[PDB]
Amino acid sequence: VPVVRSYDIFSRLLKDRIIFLGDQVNDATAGLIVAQLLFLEAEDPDKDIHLYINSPGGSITSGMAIYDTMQYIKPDVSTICIGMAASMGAFLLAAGAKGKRLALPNSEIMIHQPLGGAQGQATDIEIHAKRILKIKETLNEILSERTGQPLEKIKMDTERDNFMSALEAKEYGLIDEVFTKR
Ligand code: NA
Structure with a gap:
């Protein structure tokens, strides 16, 4: 990792209120x-946050921790997509402050329904099946309200x-702008 009285390259950009989710x-x-x-x-508490996103998604609960923190904090969290934002990556991309959600050309x-699993007794399988179904309905209702789409359209x-x-993704309502240059 490159270094820059001697920051690292990712902490030097943290001084410019830039955070990277490239994993x-x-x-x-x-x-x-x-933490960032x-x-x-x-x-x-008033200057904007610039969160670059290049992520294929991952754990839903880990992602909802990012989501809720973005809404919990006072500063507007602008999200910029570079490379790819898929599943929980795309969800956090659509979760930025409306009007400041960007993506490079x-x-x-990529958006889809939650992925999960359950193995064990049939009772425990039902408990986990109902949990992921509630998570699916929660994420869809959030995606609909952040894109403007009807709930049934997000479902299909x-x-x-x-x-x-x-x-x-701009016409769909997942982002607001597509910039080639500044
Ligand atoms: Na916020």
Whole structure:
């Protein structure tokens, strides 16, 4: 990792209120994101946050920790998609402050329904099946309110993997802008 009185390259950009989610969503990365989000709020509760997203998704609970923290903190959290934002990556992309959700022209967006599993007694399988169904309905209702789409349309569009271009994600309502240059 490159260094820059001697920061590292990712902490030097943290001074410019830039955070990177360029990895899978899990308890380790989401812990760093939350810690960076909380810290940047304590530094300045009104200056915007710039969260670059290049993530294929991951753990739903880890992602909801990022989501709720983004809404919990005072600063607007602008989200920029580079490369790919899929599943919980795309969800956190659509969760940025409305009007400041960007994506570069060749970035890949993908939304789908939750993934999970359950093995054991039939009773425990039902308990976990109902849990992931509530999570699916919760995420759909949040996606609908953040894109403007009707709830039933989000349902049909997330049953299977749904790949979109940056322009298609803008018209759909997942992002607000598609910039090639500044
Ligand atoms: Na916020």
